Design a protein around this ligand. Structure first.
Ligand SMILES: OC[C@H]1O[C@@H](O[C@H]2[C@H](O)[C@@H](O)[C@H](O)O[C@@H]2CO)[C@H](O)[C@@H](O)[C@H]1O
Ligand code: NA
Ligand SMILES: [Zn+2]
Length: 150
């Protein structure tokens, strides 16, 4: 249910980097609605521990749709500016030129991500979700709205 969703950011400039307004506890939703441009190669939604650029902030959850060939979604974690083991999902709902809704649900042990009302993937926590305070969106994507449900 999105009954408790509060959208707070509309049509942000990409790259977007913003502080998440509350702690990511179990049951929390992050809802991101947008559109993939016709020329898009990839974009990413990063749940970060902070906004440092140099050195680069750890990314607890990197969610990275890629559009070349058949398309896929790569998920990973960045710690100390280095990527870990990739989890690749080949069954991807994203398409160039199409609007989407991403719902990231925070659970005790993992994130559960649904796109366009359908389950897409799970990602086990590698960094405690209490350490996530920043949402970054980068790459070739247009974002209509960002909201949270706590
Ligand atoms: O793992 C997420 C991370 O991937 C990087 O690209 C990888 C690539 O997916 C892999 O196939 C290749 O062998 O090594 C690359 C470098 O680690 C991206 O560069 C990065 O932006 C993230 O998306
Ligand atoms: Na990156
Ligand atoms: Zn749209």
């Amino acid at each position: 249910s999105l009954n408790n969703l509060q959208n707070i950011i509309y049509n942000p400039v990409i790259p977007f980097v913003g502080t998440i307004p509350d702690q990511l506890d179990p049951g929390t939703l992050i809802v991101i609605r947008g559109h993939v441009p016709s020329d898009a190669d990839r974009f990413q939604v990063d749940l970060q521990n902070g906004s440092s650029m140099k050195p680069r902030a750890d990314v607890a959850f990197h969610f990275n749709p890629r559009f070349k060939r058949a398309g896929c979604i790569v998920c990973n974690t960045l710690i100390n500016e280095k990527w870990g083991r990739e989890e690749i999902t080949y069954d991807t709902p994203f398409k160039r030129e199409k609007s989407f809704e991403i719902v990231i649900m925070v659970l005790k042990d993992k994130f559960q991500v649904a796109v366009n009302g359908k389950h897409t993937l799970l990602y086990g926590h590698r960094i405690g979700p209490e350490k996530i305070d920043t949402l970054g969106i980068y790459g070739k994507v247009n974002i209509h709205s960002i909201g949270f449900s706590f």
